[PDB]
Amino acid sequence: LHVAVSDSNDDVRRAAVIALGFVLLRDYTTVPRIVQLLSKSHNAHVRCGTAFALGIACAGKGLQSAIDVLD
Amino acid sequence: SDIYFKLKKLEKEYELLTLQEDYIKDEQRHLKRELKRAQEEVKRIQSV
Amino acid sequence: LHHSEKKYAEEDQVQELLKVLNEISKTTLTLDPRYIWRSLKDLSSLRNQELLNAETLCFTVNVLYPDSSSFKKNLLKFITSNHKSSVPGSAELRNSYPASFYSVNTEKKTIEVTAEINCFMHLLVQLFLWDSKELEQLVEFNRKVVIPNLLCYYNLRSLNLINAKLWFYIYLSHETLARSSEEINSDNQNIILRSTMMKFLKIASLKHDNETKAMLINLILRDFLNNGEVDSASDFISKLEYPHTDVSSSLEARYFFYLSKINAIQLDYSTANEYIIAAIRKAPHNSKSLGFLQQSNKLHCCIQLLMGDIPELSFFHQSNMQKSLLPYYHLTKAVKLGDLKKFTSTITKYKQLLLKDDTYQLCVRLRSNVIKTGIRIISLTYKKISLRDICLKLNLDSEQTVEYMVSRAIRDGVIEAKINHEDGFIETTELLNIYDSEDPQQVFDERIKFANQLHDEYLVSMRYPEDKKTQQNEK
Amino acid sequence: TTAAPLLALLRENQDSVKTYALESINNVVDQLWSEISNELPDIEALYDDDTFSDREMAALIASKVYYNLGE
Amino acid sequence: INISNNLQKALTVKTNDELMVIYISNLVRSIIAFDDLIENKIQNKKIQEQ
Amino acid sequence: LSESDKKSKLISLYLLNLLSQNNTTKFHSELQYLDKHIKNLEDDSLLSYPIKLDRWLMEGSYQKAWDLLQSGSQNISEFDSFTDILKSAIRDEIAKNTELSYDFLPLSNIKALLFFNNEKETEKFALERNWPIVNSKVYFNNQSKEKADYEDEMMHEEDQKTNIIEKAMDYAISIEN
Amino acid sequence: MSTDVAAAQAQSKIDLTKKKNEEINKKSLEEDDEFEDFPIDTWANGETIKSNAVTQTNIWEENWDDVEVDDDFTNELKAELDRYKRENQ
Amino acid sequence: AAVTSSNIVLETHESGIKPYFEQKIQETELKIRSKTENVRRLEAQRNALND
Amino acid sequence: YGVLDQGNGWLYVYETPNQDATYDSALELVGQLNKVVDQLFEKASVLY
Amino acid sequence: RVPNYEVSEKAFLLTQSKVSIEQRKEAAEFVLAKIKEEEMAPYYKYLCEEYLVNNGQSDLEHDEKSDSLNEWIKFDQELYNELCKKNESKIKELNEKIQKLEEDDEGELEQAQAWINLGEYYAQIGDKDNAEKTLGKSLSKAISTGAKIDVMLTIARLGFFYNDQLYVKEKLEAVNSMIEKGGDWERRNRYKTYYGIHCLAVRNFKEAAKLLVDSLATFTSIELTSYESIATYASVTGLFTLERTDLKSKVIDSPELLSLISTTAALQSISSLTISLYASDYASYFPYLLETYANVLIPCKYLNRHADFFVREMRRKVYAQLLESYKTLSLKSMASAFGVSVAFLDNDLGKFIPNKQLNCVIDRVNGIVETNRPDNKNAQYHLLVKQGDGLLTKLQKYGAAVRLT
Structure with a gap:
């Protein structure tokens, strides 16, 4: 999470967001909050990388909450 | 007690909220520096 | 008539409580559920008193009780029995709905949540007997109800809030008997009383319940003032543990008023004076703290004299009463001129009043400060004045007698001066300009630190009303 | 009433009164603890000497005082 | 440092403003939020009746 | 009862004991107790002797106080045993x-x-x-x-x-x- | 009512049905009203007029030498004559 | 009492795991209120900067 | 901007007493902002 | 109405113990006559009670004390005969007005005018109680807005006469609401005089300087104090508010104080003082203080109530002019100039040193009088901190309040 802010090359910014989802497969209902700020981030790459993360995290069995963040 | 052993796993979850709370301050600083940067460009255009 | 009026009155009383039980059990928000009980207490009592006070007895049976019933019945007998006027089907209805108490909990009796309901009930009876006044046994009966409610119903933070009023009246009823007269009952029970409330205080620490801790503190502190065993009150305030999170503004005054007294008897009059101004700032006032506020003014004036710098004659005129401050206006004047005879005449005159207010001990020292503040006007008025001239003014024995009095005062810092013995005069030292010294930087530091704290606090308190409203039932 | 009788027994230089002091104090360690804290150093002193059997008692009492304060 | 003290005090009134706006916002949002629910019950009620 | 004649001597000598150690803090606390106890009710137990020294230290006159110590060693109530101490205490x-x-x-x-x-x-x-x-x-x-x-x-x-x-x-x- | 008056205490922390019970608790723990201890006990009340704007509780501002008597008319009168006696001696 | 524990005897200091339950559950319920309100506070400000 | 000595016949003369030209402005600053707070306090507290 | 000032001012000399013995006896004869002419016996019943335990007291309604210094003014049986007679007569007068105008003419407009006339009489005979009742009847029923303003001023006059400022206060609120509603500039001048006298009696003097000088421009003397009084009051108020520099520009040079010049003893004593204080002759100043005590403070009703406050003020004021214009001067030098003894001077300066209105300190050893006045950088620092301390306390309480709720 610190990484996404700390580098200015925007490939890395994207990557960090994506990667969180795999870490947080236990958690299903914490993930829409962690990336709630990252949809409203101004940088196109942080935004890109939000969609993957939410996707990975709640894959399989739907969740209303996750979809609402992604709209 | 049952609630108490389920707790242990909940407390870890609250700790990631703790880490969100530390993360805001790091985002804040980045934006504030940058608001002044964004403004610098517009001063270039204001002048000659 | 009677059978109907009591019927409806019992069932309304149960319903209002059942809701504030529910209210507190939904997250934490301590202050607001509490406030409901404070507005309610006042009203519930006056409604029970009209239409015979056996409207309380219907309520008392419509709770599961440990031994409240016997104590309540006795009063009814005394004003002529009212147990045939409040009768079952109108004093005992559990029904089949909850609004006169839930039927499922009552029968089962191991799920019951009667607790807080029960605490509010007891309080009502204790109050009626408190108005009337009964002592000795009254302390015993109260004390006997209260401890069972800790012990048949499990403790929560929520439980401590409402039993925080129960504590007040036991403690209070014992102090009033104690100041009436000593008694075999009073000496012995004082030991129990002092100790049991100290035992809840660390348990309150463990709870993290800030409202509870404050009320136990204030009660211990007060007993030490009443019997004069302030050798203890000193040890009590070596420690600090008083919270300010869930502590009410009304209470914060309470701590500071008594704290101000202990500091005055360690002969540190600097932080005594600090906490008495402070006490008024926290304090609200309307008319119901009128006694407290009157004594707040009296205590401030005693402290200011102890330091050695007089308050004004205008200071009491610009107070919005002087109608009990008439002795301490006379005290400002008597110290002020440097006159000893005036001090003798008033202290004898107002002896009963001084004795009551715990201001008589300070007046043994303020006899001493007649002369010490007598010096303070004369050394201020005249920068350089001979030793002999001050013997004129304050009618002092010898030139050497002058030097001794002034020397003490300047170690205590009252004069701010220096005695020169080779040129035979006292020279009052300058303050100079401190604008060119580093003193204004200390004052600002105080100001800067407090202001930074206000900007951080407001942001937290944006959020808090929003939670309260969301929980609240629709509007 | 204060703990002032209880503190006085410790200070007394006869060894039999020192043993006796802790027997009384032990009961009221949790009930008065803001008036038994003056002669807490008297209680730490008795541990140091191995000629007392009241080493045990001195520690037992001593630990509890710190918790009552909330340390 | 004195001028820096007065500047700080000024910013206390500024953040004391933001608080108010939110406190006003909170009373308006809470009334209209609840009004909607009530108003919906009546709507549903028309459907049920026939 | 709980009373003795010897009671009176102990209160008075105990007030002087604190004062010489410079527990004037405790002196002022200790006074409050004794005023409710016997000062109001049985009048004097020879309590004036300590209270008067205290007044003159706080007043700041050391002549008055030194004079009362000189006289207090020309008197016995066991005030002779505490005057020496209160001589040394005043000097510091x-x-x-x-x-x-x-x-x-x-x-x-x-x-x-x-x-x-x-x-x-x-x-x-x-x-x-x-x-x-x-x-x-x-x-x-x-x-x-x-x-x-x-x-x-x-x-x-x-x-x-x-x-x-x-x-x-x-x-x-x-x-x- | 001393430095920090009764008005600021009602306007800052607003008197409510919520706060009155708490205030009752302040008064009771102290024990009784001590506004009412003085006119029963003493059978007297505070300061009264002496010329008006000098004494008596008022929103009129006062003097700091109010208690001091007006003999000042005399003292200036005696000052002139006494001064001729010293200079012309 | 005043010489024996004989009040608040139904929890707290009964077995050591008993006071462990009590201390911690009260800390957690206070903590979750603090962490949510701060995270909300701090997000209102970061949205303002973004804005 | 002087004072006269009669203690030996001298006239002490000084130019203007030096003062914080800044602190004049800062009295005016406090006077402006202070009425802003009375309004803030009135309006936020007549809600409840 | 118009007789109230003349009557009360003379009457106040008998009440006072501190006046001249011959001026007081001559005064007793004049005031006593005015009672006989107009049957002012109810306010003479009022005057009797105010005398009690003073010199100048002679009466037979109550008791006569051993303290006396008049014998030329008493109650009579004759005085009661005129009371019984005149009162009965008054009853019969007012009855015809009321009956006739209600019935014949219009009830609202005409009776209300009849009731303004009644309320004139009630002021004349020194009944406040009936004057206010019928003049309240005049507001109730219809009349012009200008007259509603005048009637109100009439009720307000009654509080000076009996001499309670609380009474006055209530009435002037009403006058201030309707003065700007009709917008009458003639009747405003009248308002400036009434609020000015009310201010002169009370603690305030500061504002009363403005008010009084602007009522010297345009004045109505009908139901208002003598002009000679306004001129004298105006001078004293000048002292209290203004520094010595602006004394000469704003009060002494006012050309509607130099049209009258001086025409009584009271204006002459005050006029001599004001100029000599600016002129930096303190030789005649201390002698003129004695005169101003005699003729301005004691006879005047409103200034006998700040008889002490005047002494304190005007000693301070003199001391303030030298001590910013002098540093390290003898006490000795100052006494010989002043014409006062040395011993009184030491004592007067020490009244104000503890309150810090001199900010000055006095070597007794060599008689040197030192000067340490603030006016520097440190002075700006003290003002700025007293403001910024008050701002802070306000921010603390208010912030904390909003936060709890």
Whole structure:
């Protein structure tokens, strides 16, 4: 999470967001909050990388909450 | 007690909220520096 | 008539409580559920008193009780029995709905949540007997109800809030008997009383319940003032543990008023004076703290004299009463001129009043400060004045007698001066300009630190009303 | 009433009164603890000497005082 | 440092403003939020009746 | 009952005991108790004797107080056993007052003021308070210098001052936080 | 009512049905009203007029030498004559 | 009482795991209120900067 | 901007007493902002 | 109405113990006559009670004390005969007005005018109680807005006469609401005089300087104090508010104070003082203080109530002019100039040193009088901190309040 802010090359910014989802497969209902700020981030790459993360995290069995963040 | 052993796993979850709370301050600083940067460009255009 | 009026009155009383039980059990928000009980207490009592006070007895049976019933019945007998006027089907209805108490909990009796309901009930009876006044046994009966409610119903933070009023009246009823007269009952029970409330205080620490801790503190502190065993009150305030999170503004005054007294008897009059101004700032006032506020003014004036710098004659005129401050206006004047005879005449005159207010001990020292503040006007008025001239003014024995009095005062810092013995005069030292010294930087530091704290606090308190409203039932 | 009788027994230089002091104090360690804290150093002193059997008692009492304060 | 003290005090009134706006916002949002629910019950009620 | 004649002597001698140790703090606490106890109800147990010394220390007249000690050793209630102590206690108290009052004094003047019957006592007392007795004058300022140095060596005095580099930087991080 | 008056205490912390019970608790723990201890006990009340704007509780501002008597008319009168006696001696 | 524990005897200091339950559950319920309100506070400000 | 000595016949003369030209402005600053707070306090507290 | 000032001012000399013995006896004869002419016996019943335990007291309604210094003014049986007679007569007068105008003419407009006339009489005979009742009847029923303003001023006059400022206060609120509603500039001048006298009696003097000088421009003397009084009051108020520099520009040079010049003893004593204080002759100043005590403070009703406050003020004021214009001067030098003894001077300066209105300190050893006045950088620092301390306390309480709720 610190990484996404700390580098200015925007490939890395994207990557960090994506990667969180795999870490947080236990958690299903914490993930829409962690990336709630990252949809409203101004940088196109942080935004890109939000969609993957939410996707990975709640894959399989739907969740209303996750979809609402992604709209 | 049952609630108490389920707790242990909940407390870890609250700790990631703790880490969100530390993360805001790091985002804040980045934006504030940058608001002044964004403004610098517009001063270039204001002048000659 | 009677059978109907009591019927409806019992069932309304149960319903209002059942809701504030529910209210507190939904997250934490301590202050607001509490406030409901404070507005309610006042009203519930006056409604029970009209239409015979056996409207309380219907309520008392419509709770599961440990031994409240016997104590309540006795009063009814005394004003002529009212147990045939409040009768079952109108004093005992559990029904089949909850609004006169839930039927499922009552029968089962191991799920019951009667607790807080029960605490509010007891309080009502204790109050009626408190108005009337009964002592000795009254302390015993109260004390006997209260401890069972800790012990048949499990403790929560929520439980401590409402039993925080129960504590007040036991403690209070014992102090009033104690100041009436000593008694075999009073000496012995004082030991129990002092100790049991100290035992809840660390348990309150463990709870993290800030409202509870404050009320136990204030009660211990007060007993030490009443019997004069302030050798203890000193040890009590070596420690600090008083919270300010869930502590009410009304209470914060309470701590500071008594704290101000202990500091005055360690002969540190600097932080005594600090906490008495402070006490008024926290304090609200309307008319119901009128006694407290009157004594707040009296205590401030005693402290200011102890330091050695007089308050004004205008200071009491610009107070919005002087109608009990008439002795301490006379005290400002008597110290002020440097006159000893005036001090003798008033202290004898107002002896009963001084004795009551715990201001008589300070007046043994303020006899001493007649002369010490007598010096303070004369050394201020005249920068350089001979030793002999001050013997004129304050009618002092010898030139050497002058030097001794002034020397003490300047170690205590009252004069701010220096005695020169080779040129035979006292020279009052300058303050100079401190604008060119580093003193204004200390004052600002105080100001800067407090202001930074206000900007951080407001942001937290944006959020808090929003939670309260969301929980609240629709509007 | 204060703990002032209880503190006085410790200070007394006869060894039999020192043993006796802790027997009384032990009961009221949790009930008065803001008036038994003056002669807490008297209680730490008795541990140091191995000629007392009241080493045990001195520690037992001593630990509890710190918790009552909330340390 | 004195001028820096007065500047700080000024910013206390500024953040004391933001608080108010939110406190006003909170009373308006809470009334209209609840009004909607009530108003919906009546709507549903028309459907049920026939 | 719980009463004795011997009761009266113990209260009065106990008030003098605190005073000489300079537990004037405790003196004022201890008084409150005894006023409710016997001062209001049985009048005097010879309680005036301590209370009067206290008054004269607080008033700041050491003549009055020294005079009552001189008389109190011409009397017995066992006040003779506490006068010696309260003689020594008063002498240490006036040295503190007299640092700020004087810059220097004749050795015959310090002798009169802090009450002494030899010049061996007056100079012994001076060199305890680290004041040279050279020129036949005392020099009070000399002890004041050395107390100030003691304080500067410790790290408890440096942050109480609070330096201007520290104040600005701690000021800056609250804002940027 | 001393430095920090009764008005600021009602306007800052607003008197409510919520706060009155708490205030009752302040008064009771102290024990009783001590506004009412003085006119029963003493059978007297505070300061009264002496010329008006000098004494008596008022929003009129006062003097700091109010208690001191007006003999000042005399003292200036005696000052002139006494001054001729010293100079012309 | 005043010489024996004989009040608040139904929890707290009964077996050591008993006071462990009590201390911690009260800390957690206070903590979750603090962490949510701060995270909300701090997000209102970061949205303002973004804005 | 002087004062007269009668203690030996001298006239002490000084130019204007030096003063904080800044602190004049800062009295006016406090006077402006202070009425802003009375309004803030009135309006936020007549809600409840 | 118009007789109230003349009557009360003379009457106040008998009440006072501190006046001249011959001026007081001559005064007793004049005031006593005015009672006989108009049957002012109810306010003479009022005057009797105010005398009690003073010199100048002679009466037979109550008791006569051993303290006396008049014998030329008493109650009579004759005085009661005129009371019984005149009162009965008054009853019969007012009855015809009321009956006739209600019935014949219009009830609202005409009776209300009849009731303004009644309310004139009630002021004349020194009944306040009936004057206010019927003049309240005049507001109730219809009348012009200008008259509603005048009637109100009439009720307000009654509080000076009996001499309670609380009474006055209530009435002037009403006058201030309707003065700007009709917008009458003639009747405003009248308002400036009434609020000015009310201010002169009370603690305030500061504002009363403005008010009084602007009522010297345009004045109505009908139901208002003598002009000679306004001129004298105007001078004293000048002292209290203004510094010595602006004394000469704003009060003494006012050309509607130099049209009258001086025409009574009271204006002459005050006029001599004001100029000599600016002129920096303190030789005649201390002698003129004695005169101003005699003729301005004691006879005047409103200034006998700040008889002490005047002494304190005007000693301070003199001391303030030298001490910013002098540093390290003898006490000795100052006494010989002043014409006062040395011993009184030491004592007067020490009244104000503890309150810090001199900020000055006095070597007794060599008689030197030192000067340490603030006016520097440190002075700006003290003002700025007293403001910024008050701002802070306000921010603390208010912030904390909003936060709890």
